Design a protein around this ligand. Structure first.
Ligand SMILES: *Cc1c(COP(=O)(O)O)cnc(C)c1O
Ligand SMILES: *Cc1c(COP(=O)(O)O)cnc(C)c1O
Ligand SMILES: *Cc1c(COP(=O)(O)O)cnc(C)c1O
Ligand SMILES: *Cc1c(COP(=O)(O)O)cnc(C)c1O
Ligand SMILES: *C(CS)[C@H](N)C(=O)O
Ligand SMILES: *C(CS)[C@H](N)C(=O)O
Lengths: 396, 396, 396, 396
């Protein structure tokens, strides 16, 4: 064993894989990072040796993108991964590949609003039936499975309510009933929960949020448990033309290196903020998987590794007017905007910013209430973050 | 009026629009190029003033991308444009938006292979009927339209045969039958043919090819004739998550500046190469709209502005074996690879690469003969290009 | 000879070198463009095989930068080239490497104001004597050479007056007197004049201007006639830490591909604009090397290949007030700003924007008069450019 | 006050400044990150309103670069900062601005090798006297100052020996003698030591190392204690043409966000590795400010905040041959290369690489013994790092 080689028979530990997974020094120059293959097409040696160097056209595959895919498959525990322009593109490619007219698809009723809308407003025109149900009890999923069910699509924690789904239990149900279990674990990250380890067949990630973690790029990933599934996704990505770009892949290769230390800091901050909010006399309810009152505490402790995440939610006393006054007065360092997962702490109101297309009776039915505030905790000093919330709450 | 203003009541001439369309100096700093908005999310001033500055999240819209879209809409003569991660993503968004189960779509039978395979594999599973016909006679289109026809999808010149479609005549037919006419004018560029000027309802572009012209980025664009069509495309792009990235849009904003002078040089080179090939004893047939043997020379003179383009094709005598010997010996500066439209001259044999997914019997049905070679002419010195072809032909 | 090889014993023609110089397809993947080596450090195989793959640290050399250097040395006709963060960095590295206290340096008195200021205001504190003289007559240079003269630094055409220097004649003088002849040919480009072909020992370029040509990047280059000179420049670049970045090198590799067609278009536009101005009743003087009244016409015809360039200058009748009114009313597509060489046409007034640090009596002495306007012609439609000048002149 | 404002009268705490210092949402669009001003020149509103929007030409200043400069000045506690293409460019600008013929400069004799060689080769030719002395005792500095001394240039910890300099004491000396105290605190980072807080007049940083922390960019910064010093640095940067690019500034704006959590992880790992090495029988000496054998432990406790850093050094028993056997067998995840500060752990032997330009007798004079190894600890799992060192040491 010489410089440049791993020790044989040793599995590198987890943080080492975030730093080095999928990437060795460039064979040509020794460059320690992946060179960015900002290029459309690849020259072939001869007609007979077509594809002998592995690449032909960047819509189909690109070397920088492939380095990130290998890293993501390692981190998530999958056979292979495919990277996409956005998280929505990853989700839509799953629905495109694995559903056909007449099929039934069970979706957590608290899915990300984008997942919910691409199903209802687009794929349902192909006579695909999406049924939205409560995934908090796995027996609900078992009882709701119909003869035409092809896909069970879980999300955990859920955007924006932070409901959990028992991924292991649901995977056992789907394995018995021979249906595909797809899990969107964007809010968890693989540092907290790897659905493939818990039996899911496919994971979808919006790499926009925590894999990037810097508000820099859009991106998506599909991580497949098997070669058969991986090849189906890969084929359809080339047809739909929604692959990630090499430059986005370079950025994500760099930011993934710090995902463990970022998520540790964000989650330590979020625990302290959730505790503060839970004691605050102008806060009605606080939702965080790590505080003792979390309704699905036992599942959180079973299914979360290391941390309980950077996301929390709360409701201000006084209804919508008080929620709005609070939002309008939250000072820097907080940012009032959509998205989540970043070094910069973000405060969002789902009624207006993310789930505005959902009927208010239905919003209330899922738990998106009037004073409901979604919080993405960043890596600022937690005392500045609490000071800003306390000011805004005093104004509410 | 003053420095920094266009004079009111004047319309810039063609080349000026390539340099300046869609862009003004940054209002904040005066930067002569738009900055790159390499950022996911946009801060809002208040819950009330939501979207008051025009942006919320870059999957939906991004300022750099919107500047490119405004330029492209100006160059193509449309109401608005949407930009995509690839040309295939643009095409697939048209099929996704405008077709539903039971609908019918007419597609030119010599389409780019990717258009053909996204139809035939994928969308056909939704009980959408795609019919491939010969667009060289508009009455074929008129006769094949059904009550269920929603889209007529032309391409001109066609990939790889360079057949022309009479866009004005087909538009007249489609207007009478109230069917959408979508035209893929990637091979023409708007400098040679603007389908919206000739009555098409939608234009699809692979910006990868000539708009980029440098083998640098992938990209697509959909240019809509009306607000109603544009809004449908924009909505579905947000759902499918296949928008162009800001960094790609910046590259294409830069490269579009030189499209007229690039296409003029490529086309002058192509005319000379086509004339050379038409006299060479190893060459069976040459296809170029600018030489007198072109079968649709009358339509080329009616429909082509400025140039006859950088693309040509030819058949080497001696069939497949001769074509392969030739390809294996084409020297630099030629590149043996997929793609087209670039400063670097590219050659390929579609029977063995791009359209090798098509049955040889069907290959011949669509004119891709055994010795057929697609040539994308770049901006090198034409004597190097001709000397290289002459050397390669000596090995056939 | 097979695909991927050049024909042996053939020198590729000039436009082919702009497209392909310094770049072959990536050996690892076949990528047709140079991958961007966005990376600081390079891993070594062993202590003994240090530098066996050619790279160690990007301040010293970087693979993308080296690909551009090889291309620039080919285009300019030099032994080697070194690329820098800016044109000023290239110039300052020359002064740093080849002058020491007690040395005399002859500088064209109409040098770029930055060259003039770094000499007067900085290197003169090291007791280096910069003497500014009229380079229009080579015998002036011969007569002004002193025992301590080490460097003769010409520029042609000169910024902003467009005076020419006879590079061949001056090189003969410097070769006889054993002094180094450095030529800044930024305004010419190697498509119009290659000083190394005319005997200069070093060329300095601001790649910012025409090599980029898109207002995108800053950059500089030093092209050396010999290995001894090249190695001295390379060594000092590593010490001064002013190398070009890989991303800037990637952009310049792409934009250099179109330098010939850009400069042809800009120069055809500039000829027409200079003719228009020379007939205009509110224009006092027009300076362009291609119009028949140019005072150094005979030298322009001897020393310029293909074109007479994109730069021109003129004076409006009515002195400074009229020049200012004209500038304030020049409409789009023109831009009022510093810099030059770009696809976007630029109008500058040197008194305020570039040579404001020069005493007004001295400005007048060099020819930077009151109504003096420097024009950089882009690739817009020339009729829009003339329309805009004619409007502004009517307002002046 | 309102969303988007800092509360007046409050100062953000340390980690918040790393996330948000120097940056506010884009005023035009609300973009949460500053856009990349990848552009050379800036349009002016009128000849009169020249520079009214703050920018003219990116060699002089660029908006993205200025945002980074504001962040860096906040983090380091300075009046202002200037950013450069590399750390060497920052250092060379100090020597260029503040020294003239006849002046004297005191430099720590264990400086980074590049500082030492830019002094000894290059600036000494201008009759500037550089004197290299041992900064571990401040009275050496006091005794060596001459009437001609203009600059005292410290480094702490030193590259590669990790000697400390007492920055507060040296500043007191320099204040008494009215000499500029410049401190290169690259190895410390501002999270561990801010020399401006301890009385230094100027700080030099290689942002390549920890500010970047990802082996992605080269860069430098000069942080000035006063407006007069800042203005001198800014003026000369424009003359030397060695400003940082906008794209580099964007990368560093992103990576600085995580400097506290990166340095905390690197330092925790380094403490454990130093303790492991201090017990290993093949290791002669270990140098780390956090272990009790550190010779300057009293100063380390006074001068180091939060951590003792990611850098350590050790000597392998058996001299040069043993060091080489060890280096040749250090396995992944270690990288054998130059540079330091990164997420990827780096090891090198300065006698054979970084300081092999120093005479072995002088190498030993400055403490770089034959078996001396400089170690830059990254953020991998410490057990992989320790297992790899243990394997390598078994080959020594
Ligand atoms: C944001 C998000 C998505 C969609 O990803 P994009 O990258 O925005 O297209 C999907 N799932 C969750 C849980 C998300 O937060
Ligand atoms: C290449 C091409 C496409 C597909 O565009 P991509 O950018 O490769 O996805 C569509 N139409 C034509 C005519 C094409 O040449
Ligand atoms: C602009 C210029 C320079 C300086 O180059 P920068 O890239 O701006 O540092 C040098 N010479 C001429 C003739 C120039 O126009
Ligand atoms: C690397 C380094 C430098 C030089 O900075 P570059 O960015 O490599 O030019 C200066 N000081 C120290 C302590 C350094 O480690
Ligand atoms: C989706 C809104 S388009 C976004 N990622 C969010 O949940 O804020
Ligand atoms: C130099 C001004 S800093 C610039 N390139 C010009 O001449 O406009």
């Amino acid at each position: 064993v010489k410089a440049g080689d791993w020790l044989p028979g040793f599995t590198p530990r987890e943080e080492t894989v975030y730093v080095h997974g999928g990437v060795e020094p460039d064979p040509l120059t020794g460059a320690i990072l992946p060179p960015i293959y900002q290029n459309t097409t690849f020259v072939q040696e001869s007609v007979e040796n077509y594809l002998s160097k592995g690449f032909s056209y960047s819509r189909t595959s690109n070397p920088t993108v492939l380095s990130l895919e290998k890293k993501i498959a390692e981190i998530e525990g999958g056979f292979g991964a495919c990277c996409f322009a956005t998280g929505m593109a990853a989700t839509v490619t799953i629905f495109s590949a694995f559903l056909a007219p007449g099929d039934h698809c069970l979706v957590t009723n608290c899915s990300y609003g984008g997942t919910n809308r691409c199903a209802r407003l687009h794929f349902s025109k192909y006579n695909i039936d999406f049924e939205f149900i409560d995934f908090r009890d796995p027996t609900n999923v078992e009882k709701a499975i119909r003869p035409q069910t092809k896909v069970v699509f879980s999300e955990s924690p859920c955007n924006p309510t932070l409901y959990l789904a028992d991924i292991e239990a649901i995977s056992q149900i789907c394995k018995e009933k021979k249906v595909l279990h797809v899990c969107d674990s964007t809010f968890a990250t693989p540092y907290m929960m790897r659905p493939l380890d818990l039996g899911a067949d496919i994971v979808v990630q919006s790499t926009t949020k925590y894999y990037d973690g810097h508000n820099c790029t859009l991106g998506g990933a599909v991580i497949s448990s098997t070669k058969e599934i991986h090849d189906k996704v890969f084929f359809l990505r080339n047809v739909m033309g929604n692959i990630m770009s090499a430059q986005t892949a370079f950025y994500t290769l760099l930011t993934l290196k710090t995902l463990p230390i970022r998520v540790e800091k964000q989650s330590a901050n979020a625990q302290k903020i959730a505790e503060f909010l839970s004691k605050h006399h102008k806060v009605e309810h606080v939702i965080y998987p790590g505080i003792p009152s979390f309704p699905q505490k036992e599942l959180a402790l079973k299914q979360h590794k290391n941390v309980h995440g950077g996301m929390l939610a709360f409701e201000v006393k006084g209804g919508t007017e008080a929620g709005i006054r609070m939002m309008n007065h939250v000072p820097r360092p907080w940012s009032l905007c959509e998205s989540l997962g970043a070094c910069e702490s973000i405060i969002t109101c789902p009624a207006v910013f993310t789930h505005a297309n959902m009927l208010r009776e239905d919003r209330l039915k899922v738990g998106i209430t009037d004073g409901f505030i979604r919080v993405s905790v960043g890596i600022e000093d937690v005392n500045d973050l609490i000071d800003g919330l306390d000011y805004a709450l005093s104004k509410a």
